[PDB]
Design a protein around this ligand. Structure first.
Ligand SMILES: *[C@@H]1O[C@H](CO)[C@@H](O[C@@H]2O[C@H](CO)[C@@H](O[C@@H]3O[C@H](CO)[C@@H](O)[C@H](O)[C@@H]3O)[C@H](O)[C@H]2NC(C)=O)[C@H](O)[C@H]1NC(C)=O
Ligand SMILES: *[C@@H]1O[C@H](CO)[C@@H](O)[C@H](O)[C@H]1NC(C)=O
Ligand SMILES: *[C@@H]1O[C@H](CO)[C@@H](O)[C@H](O)[C@H]1NC(C)=O
Ligand SMILES: *[C@@H]1O[C@H](CO)[C@@H](O)[C@H](O)[C@H]1NC(C)=O
Ligand SMILES: [Ca+2]
Ligand SMILES: [Ca+2]
Ligand SMILES: [Cu+2]
Ligand SMILES: [Zn+2]
Lengths: 1200, 478
């Protein structure tokens, strides 16, 4: 169906509980005079645009504000005339009206929901997206221009949209200022009308908005969220997030929806949800006991000195903590045997769905405490709430915990959910005091906790000061250096490798990994040299939001001493690392268990982040593929891999294959080649300069994609000598592992799809190993902004090349993010959606990339043209985190004017010539005594200078003949360029360092060589390798424009209906009937052209396409009838949209006169430099020879 | 990453020599004999040393195909083009070839088709140089001129006279007859044969004249005159677009000027430029007549001539047909229409595609007028669309090198063992012909045979009175 929406950017005054904000507002009529009512619970959110899978959305946007706006949609498909974003897409000014809608103006956007844009079999009933103003992302987002877009299944057309948004008033359009953390534009629980049904499940279409990287954990008290049929305690909202959650409301009353991050408690992202009508029993005896805890036993000590050594103002290792202890009997006399691994954790509590936990807690400490679980809801006294109820010291209390159905894992979740229990008297203070314990909620056990204990927040800080410090009086509690020594970043309470878990080789291990403590950022947990099965897929890095736990499955097949840690540099250097010990307990076609040898070096090169397209140059270190082991000739990177940029070479392998990487350190400081797939059978992975090392291993099923996900999976390899500085220095690369019989034996890649690897990161040159040299070379609080680059593959500001793909082919994107916690990248392909596969198939249009994780998505581009893949984080996009990719069509392959004469003689040059065989004669089918370019020298070249960059799909070469000799070019290579300064030889699908084309064998045969993948260039250049007598060429360039609008509209092929062509008059007699419907190009027969009855300069031939098309060129031709050559020599063109309102095609302020034919048989094409978006075309002939006759062919493409 | 799947040998550049040939110098059946022009070494996969590469496959050097127009042939295979035949041998064409030739034609009343395929219209009433070797540095061997009388707008009663000077001999072709005004110095290779509707005059090794006795004049010259002839028939250089070169070595854009540049006698007035009248008198302001003309000339692209549309260009012949039929009052008796169709059919049959287009309804022809079986003539006159023009007769007992494979018209079949006689128009015994024999060559009575023309001590001129042969020593001029 067709749905009409009237949107206006109304500028209003908003109070969160009074600032100025521009909001999308829905009206009732096209006059934009009456505003449509909106329910109070929506707030700053615009109207919800709901579309089914086979609908089309028409929105009329009127800018009623003082700044330009737009409507850039996510999830749906549209033409370049409705994208709503402005960038270098090389479209006409008619297709640029969507980019900005200046105040007082208006525009109409048409969004098509296709089968490509519909939810998959596993996706819910309606997918969630948003539309937003995209003129200036930061200001538009902070001003309140955002709205929901629900793409539902056919027949779909209770549910609420929740906008968890941080509006920064300092970066809005009206800033010329606090950050308000709001739900639907409201703070401090002021959001009204958020009602829910008593028993019926409720669907939340959650949109998280933010212009800066700022994560959130969203909790609804006493409830859990079903996301992708996975049970979760909270929503992990990234700065720009779309997700669908399902909550089974069961209890009447008012509950709180809030962000649980401690630093955001004063911010106010809180709202109320009003739910209204619309047998095994474990016994545990746990006691809270005060005791001295040694954060680093048997460690000899810098960070170690500052954190562990005792001094005048340093407490040291031991702190007086309070801990949960398990007792065998009710009398609390003998403690159960403790484990060195569990550390500061309390007893492990276990429960299945329906099991009952009978907890008996005695407060044996000197301060009141409590015990309470997270995740478990039905907590009651055995005989306000027990959460805030304190237990006085020496008392005994009994709790009953009932693991209900809405607490246990679903069939898609792992068998056990990792939760916790702790004291809820003073959450942060009791947690920092040491009261924390693991809990497992399983369906009808190595626990690892990453905990930041802030001893400065502990209740026993005073006692520690008075005991472990010689002078308690001389203690400055506010000293940052003193406070830093008390914040212990530990794993199970152990700091600086004081924890060493030992597991047996070839065994199966379940790791329950939990993230609780003082930390407010997410953790990138990793096991060096181990991949683990999370959420039914083998991954490498675990993202843990605060107060969250994840179950992980892994087989310990890799022996040695490994480091378990997190990819946070400060936490890694502050002792949040653990050790893990694993040990035993005739003619042929060239194209039609193996070891895949590679040769990668670490090389130092200059890099300007694509700013040459004074400009600073930074000396970085990168991975470089060489031809062989000599490391003296780097392997040429061609058209297929030019998109890599700073990313290293693709290392491709299949299961059961052997990867053998020879790595040579040619840089100035030691580096390494580290991948989590490298298996052995600690080790010094440390490559000094001018030294080589071989990494050989076998690819196994845990390194490979499962049977459900795509045919290949991407892993990251990098230097692990310093995980932070080496990534900022430019060492990173893709390692593809594919299913069996999925790589081409001759080429080494999966040729069924086209693959692109994008690595998004913020390079910080201040954190590189070459910062001093870069400062010395370049420089002879904005200082750091000039050294931070929000790059894709090392490119900013749409300067990354090579992202060129064919229309209607399947594209596989490997998306990687690396760096600190600011690298939460909201990657979006404008106008295009993709699918991801964990165990099912999910349709998405945005993806949140977390550092260390290498995602794989697949898409199918339908529209041709230049699109942008960006990050929807406003600050990152403004700093230049975006790039352009071109989707070309194979259909548009038309002559570039070498034979037609459209390429003038000044656009063809050569190294030289023989006699008068000028380069301007190098044209296909050129006839004469001297009819070709020819030179009597070796090592020549002929260059064609197309005026603008365009797509070249192939070249048609042809030789020539002299008096008795045939001259031709047998073999040639092709170079090309976009500025005439840097020349890149063509490679295509070649197995070698360039693609070698074979030319002619005679003087008349046309040899057509294809460019696949194509060339995107302004200059092209041919170098003859072999020639018969002289390098003689008559060539013809086959190609198209960037937007792929040069193909005929269906006149020569007779695709236009006979009722679609008309005229003012047509000449007919008893024999010849020159009807308008016979004016098609190259038509052969009697009366094969349109001819009016009366010859006059006010005639016209009209073609109606019955749909809006883009005309970019008109091809005209005459006829030779009854030995009379009748043809139009000059004509003009007029356009109309309804058939009765015509306008002449004027050029440069006056009407353009088109030069027709010189002879009746050769067609001539006049190309409209401004494209003509029209439905009705008219040709008015002005000068005619021997009659008014015309055979026409329209060149163009489709539009909306 | 340079994974060359076997048995393809991988070649990696030393990166030090900077002179080694790599992948750029790939050997191929196309360029096995050609030197490589390499900018610098390229690394990649190559066919094994005993094999070369062919498209997307490696083949043995002994199995490299030879190339021809849009086609490949395996070694040992044979092909035939024009006058030559070749065999595939070592990627080359080992040819056992004769000497090719080309034909310049006088199509229609005033249309000329050159040796290089250029067709033009020139209604000149003067006498013009049809073809001459007198072009700058010239040997001065032959000169053929054509004079048209009545080929103006009233071209109904036009006539053409051909004057040929060769080896000091003058031959006039006019009114369907050939008159030798002055005998040639060497008459050994001078022959005139009348076969069917055509007359073929061999005036040397590479000079042939074909006449339909009404309007079609065809000059057949071997390729040895590729750069020696000039005139209305072009310079025979193989290039179509430069046939309009005037006698003063200047290319004329207007065909009228090109035709006027080759005028023989200055007494006649030069042909002035006239606007091209597409519809002449009969076809002027008559849609029905133009429709009838177009329908009549459409036969050149019908099913009978379908096999010829792929070999002979039908556009010029169709244009000539339309122009000539638009000057005729009726299509049934239009001599130019039938002559043009016959010329087109002859051209088609010269390529091997004989077309039997004649019928009683359109241009009827029969041999019953000369089939006087009951009048003592023991010959069977039968019509043939393409029959050999060099059949052995009493007047021509020795086989001759026929410039054309076969001709159309009435031919006199004879009982086996008999020989036709044109003087008696009947089949007689082979020994009954008044033919003498010398040096293994048989020639009819009245013919002169020259032996050792370049040897004065052995030069002999032999004549045949009836059956006796009389040879006399050649007289030395000095
Ligand atoms: C260079 O490599 C590319 C990709 O490896 C080649 O293009 C691909 O060629 C195959 C033909 O083998 C195309 O497959 C065909 O697709 C059509 C449309 O779906 C289908 O109907 C056919 O049955 C067949 O499967 C494929 O679409 C095409 N892809 C692209 C992006 O072009 C290319 O031919 C190679 N060129 C050279 C010179 O080696
Ligand atoms: C919301 O609450 C916070 C703390 O609870 C307070 O500082 C703030 O003034 C309140 N109002 C707004 C509009 O933030
Ligand atoms: C490494 O080798 C290069 C030349 O191969 C040399 O210039 C450099 O000094 C070497 N670095 C060392 C030995 O540390
Ligand atoms: C061509 O074939 C003939 C006969 O088979 C042979 O004698 C001759 O050597 C071959 N090659 C050439 C160049 O004539
Ligand atoms: Ca646009
Ligand atoms: Ca010529
Ligand atoms: Cu970002
Ligand atoms: Zn928050």
């Amino acid at each position: 169906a067709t749905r009409r929406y009237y949107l206006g950017a109304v500028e209003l005054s908003w109070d969160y509980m009074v600032y100025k904000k521009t909001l999308f507002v829905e009206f009732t009529d096209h006059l934009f005079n009456i505003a449509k009512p909106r329910p109070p619970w929506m707030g700053l959110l615009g109207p919800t645009i709901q579309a089914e899978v086979y609908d089309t959305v028409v929105i009329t946007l009127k800018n009623m504000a003082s700044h330009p706006v737009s409507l850039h949609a996510v999830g749906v498909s549209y033409w370049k005339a409705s994208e709503g974003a402005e960038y270098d897409d090389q479209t006409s000014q008619r297709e640029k009206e969507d980019d900005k809608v200046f105040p007082g103006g208006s525009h109409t956007y048409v969004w098509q929901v296709l089968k490509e844009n519909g939810p998959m079999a596993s996706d819910p009933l309606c997918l969630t997206y948003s539309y937003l103003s995209h003129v200036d992302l930061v200001k538009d987002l902070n001003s309140g221009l955002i709205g929901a877009l629900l793409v539902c299944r056919e027949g779909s057309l209770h549910k609420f949209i929740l906008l968890f948004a941080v509006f920064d008033e300092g970066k809005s359009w009206h800033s010329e200022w606090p950050k308000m953390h709001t739900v639907n534009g409201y703070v401090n629980r002021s959001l009204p009308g958020l009602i829910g049904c008593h028993r019926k499940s409720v669907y939340w279409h959650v949109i998280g908005m933010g212009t800066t990287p700022e994560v959130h954990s969203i909790f609804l008290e006493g409830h859990t969220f079903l996301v992708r049929n996975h049970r979760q305690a909270s929503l992990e909202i990234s700065p720009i997030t779309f997700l669908t959650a399902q909550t089974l409301l069961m209890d009447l009353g008012q509950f709180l929806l809030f962000c649980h991050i401690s630093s955001h408690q004063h911010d106010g992202m809180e709202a109320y949800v009003k739910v209204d009508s619309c047998p095994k029993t474990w016994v545990h005896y746990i006691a809270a006991e005060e005791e001295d805890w040694d954060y680093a036993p048997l460690v000899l000590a810098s960070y170690k000195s500052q954190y562990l050594n005792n001094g005048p103002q340093r407490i040291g290792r031991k702190y007086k903590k309070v801990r949960f202890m398990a007792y065998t009997d009710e009398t609390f006399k003998t403690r159960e045997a403790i484990q060195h691994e569990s550390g500061i954790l309390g007893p492990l509590l276990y429960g299945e769905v329906g099991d009952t936990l009978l907890i008996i807690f005695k407060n044996q400490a000197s301060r009141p405490y409590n015990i309470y679980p997270h995740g478990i809801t039905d907590v009651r006294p055995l005989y306000k709430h027990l959460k805030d109820f304190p237990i006085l010291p020496g008392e005994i209390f009994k709790y009953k915990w009932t693991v209900t159905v809405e607490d246990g894992p679903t069939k898609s979740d792992p068998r056990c959910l990792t939760r916790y229990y702790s004291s809820f008297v003073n959450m942060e203070r009791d947690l920092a005091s040491g009261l924390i314990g693991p809990l497992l909620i399983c369906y009808k056990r190595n626990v690892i906790l990453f905990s930041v204990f802030d001893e400065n927040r502990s209740w026993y800080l005073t006692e520690n000061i008075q005991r472990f410090l010689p002078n308690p009086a001389g203690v400055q509690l506010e000293d940052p250096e003193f406070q830093a020594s008390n914040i212990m970043h530990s794993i199970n309470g152990y700091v600086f490798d004081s924890l060493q878990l030992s597991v047996c080789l070839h065994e199966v291990a379940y790791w329950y990994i939990l993230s609780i403590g003082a930390q407010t950022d997410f953790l990138s947990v990793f096991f060096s040299g181990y991949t683990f099965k999370h959420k039914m897929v083998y991954e490498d890095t675990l993202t843990l939001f605060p107060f969250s736990g994840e179950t992980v499955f892994m087989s310990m097949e890799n022996p040695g001493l490994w480091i378990l840690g997190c990819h946070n540099s400060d936490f890694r250097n502050r002792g949040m690392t653990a050790l893990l010990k694993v040990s035993s307990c005739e003619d042929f076609d060239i194209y039609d268990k193996k070891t895949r040898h590679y040769f990668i070096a670490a090389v130092e090169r200059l890099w300007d982040y694509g700013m040459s397209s004074s400009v600073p140059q930074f000396k970085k270190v990168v991975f470089q593929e060489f031809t062989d082991g000599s490391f003296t000739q780097p392997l040429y990177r061609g058209e297929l891999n030019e998109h890599l940029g700073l990313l290293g070479p693709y290392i491709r392998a299949e299961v059961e294959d052997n990867i053998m990487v020879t790595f040579r350190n040619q840089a100035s400081r030691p580096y390494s080649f580290y991948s989590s797939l490298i298996s052995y059978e600690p080790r010094k992975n440390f490559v000094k300069p001018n030294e080589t090392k071989t990494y050989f291993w076998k690819v196994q099923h845990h390194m490979a994609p499962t049977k459900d996900e795509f045919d290949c999976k991407a892993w990251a390899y990098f230097s692990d000598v310093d995980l932070e500085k080496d990534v900022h220095s430019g060492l990173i690369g893709p390692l593809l592992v594919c299913h069996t019989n999925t790589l081409n034996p001759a080429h080494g890649r999966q040729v069924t799809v086209q693959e692109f690897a994008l690595f998004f990161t913020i390079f910080d040159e201040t954190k590189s190993w070459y910062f001093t040299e870069n400062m010395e070379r370049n420089c002879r609080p904005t200082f750091k902004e000039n050294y931070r680059f929000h790059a894709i593959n090392g490119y900013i500001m749409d300067t990354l090349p090579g992202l060129v793909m064919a229309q209607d082919q399947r594209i596989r994107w490997y998306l990687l993010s690396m760096g600190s916690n600011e690298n939460i990248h909201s990657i979006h392909f404008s106008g295009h959606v993709f699918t991801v596969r964990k165990k099912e198939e999910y349709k998405m249009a945005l993806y949140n990339l977390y550092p260390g994780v290498f995602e794989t998505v697949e898409m199918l581009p339908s529209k041709a043209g230049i699109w942008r893949v960006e990050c929807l984080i406003g600050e990152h996009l403004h700093a230049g985190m975006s790039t352009l990719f071109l989707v070309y069509s194979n259909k548009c392959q038309t002559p570039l004017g070498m034979a037609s004469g459209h390429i003038r003689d000044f656009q063809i040059t050569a190294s030289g010539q023989y006699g008068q065989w000028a380069p301007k004669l190098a044209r296909l089918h050129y006839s004469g005594s001297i009819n070709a370019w020819s030179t009597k020298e070796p090592f020549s070249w002929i260059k064609v200078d197309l005026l603008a960059p365009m797509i070249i799909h192939g070249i048609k070469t042809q030789g020539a003949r002299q008096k008795f000799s045939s001259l031709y070019i047998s073999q040639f290579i092709i170079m090309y360029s976009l500025d005439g300064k840097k020349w890149q030889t063509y490679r295509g699908n070649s197995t070698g360092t360039l693609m070698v084309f074979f030319g002619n064998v005679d003087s008349s045969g046309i040899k057509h060589n294809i460019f696949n993948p194509p060339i995107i260039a302004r200059y092209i250049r041919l170098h003859p390798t072999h020639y018969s007598i002289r390098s003689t060429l008559r060539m013809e360039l086959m190609g198209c424009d960037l937007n792929s609008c040069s193909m005929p509209l269906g006149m020569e092929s007779k695709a236009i209906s006979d009722a679609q062509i008309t005229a003012s008059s047509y000449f007919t007699n008893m024999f010849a009937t020159w009807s308008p419907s016979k004016a098609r190009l190259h038509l052969q027969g009697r009366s094969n052209a349109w001819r009016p009855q009366v010859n006059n300069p006010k005639e016209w031939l009209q073609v109606d396409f019955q749909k809006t098309m883009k005309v970019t060129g008109v091809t005209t031709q005459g006829v030779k009838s009854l030995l009379t050559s009748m043809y139009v020599k000059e004509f003009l063109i007029s356009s109309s949209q309804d058939g009765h309102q015509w306008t002449l095609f004027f050029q440069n302020g006056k009407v353009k006169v088109f030069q027709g034919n010189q002879d009746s048989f050769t067609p001539v094409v006049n190309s409209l430099d401004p494209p003509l978006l029209t439905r009705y075309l008219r040709i008015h002939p002005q000068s005619w020879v021997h009659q008014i006759a015309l055979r026409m062919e329209v060149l163009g493409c489709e539009a909306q | 990453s340079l994974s060359c799947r076997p048995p393809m040998v991988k070649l990696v550049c030393p990166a030090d020599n900077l002179r080694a040939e790599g992948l750029e110098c790939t050997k191929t059946c196309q360029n096995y004999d050609l030197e490589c022009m390499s900018m610098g070494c390229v690394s990649g996969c190559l066919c094994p040393p005993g094999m070369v590469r062919h498209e997307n496959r490696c083949v043995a050097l002994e199995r490299c195909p030879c190339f021809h127009q849009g086609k490949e042939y395996a070694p040992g295979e044979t092909v035939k083009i024009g006058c030559n035949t070749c065999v595939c041998r070592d990627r080359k064409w080992n040819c056992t070839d004769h000497v090719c030739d080309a034909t310049c034609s006088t199509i229609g009343m005033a249309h000329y088709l050159t040796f290089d395929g250029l067709k033009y219209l020139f209604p000149g009433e003067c006498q013009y140089v049809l073809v001459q070797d007198y072009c700058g540095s010239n040997p001065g061997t032959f000169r053929i001129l054509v004079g048209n009388k009545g080929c103006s707008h009233p071209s109904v009663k036009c006539k053409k006279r051909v004057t040929i000077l060769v080896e000091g001999g003058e031959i006039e072709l006019f009114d369907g007859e050939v008159n030798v005004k002055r005998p040639m110095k060497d008459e050994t290779h001078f022959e005139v044969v009348e076969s069917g509707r055509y007359i073929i005059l061999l005036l040397g090794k590479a000079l042939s004249v074909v006449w339909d006795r009404h309007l079609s004049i065809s000059v057949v010259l071997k390729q040895t005159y590729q750069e020696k002839v000039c005139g209305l028939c072009g310079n025979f250089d193989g290039i179509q677009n430069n046939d309009l070169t005037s006698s003063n070595l200047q290319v004329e854009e207007d065909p009228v000027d090109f035709g006027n540049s080759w005028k023989v006698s200055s007494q006649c007035a030069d042909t002035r430029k006239v606007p091209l009248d597409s519809s002449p008198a009969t076809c002027h302001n008559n849609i029905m007549k133009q429709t009838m003309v177009d329908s009549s000339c459409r036969i050149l692209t019908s099913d009978v001539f379908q096999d010829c549309n792929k070999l002979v260009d039908p556009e010029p012949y169709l244009d000539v047909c339309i122009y000539d039929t638009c000057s005729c009052e009726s299509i049934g008796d239009c001599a130019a229409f039938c002559d043009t169709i016959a010329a087109y059919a002859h051209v088609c049959a010269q390529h091997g595609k004989v077309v039997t287009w004649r019928t009683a309804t359109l241009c009827p022809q029969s041999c019953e007028e000369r089939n006087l079986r009951e009048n003592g003539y023991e010959a069977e006159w039968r019509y043939n669309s393409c029959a050999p023009a060099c059949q052995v007769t009493c007047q021509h007992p020795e086989p001759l090198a026929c410039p054309v494979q076969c001709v159309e018209g009435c031919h006199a079949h004879c009982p086996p063992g008999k020989i036709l006689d044109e003087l008696l128009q009947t089949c007689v015994d082979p020994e009954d012909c008044p033919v003498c024999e010398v040096a293994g060559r048989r020639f009819a009575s009245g013919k002169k045979v020259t032996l050792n023309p370049s040897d004065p001590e052995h030069c002999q001129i032999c004549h045949c009175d009836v059956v006796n042969l009389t040879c006399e020593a050649c007289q030395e001029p000095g």
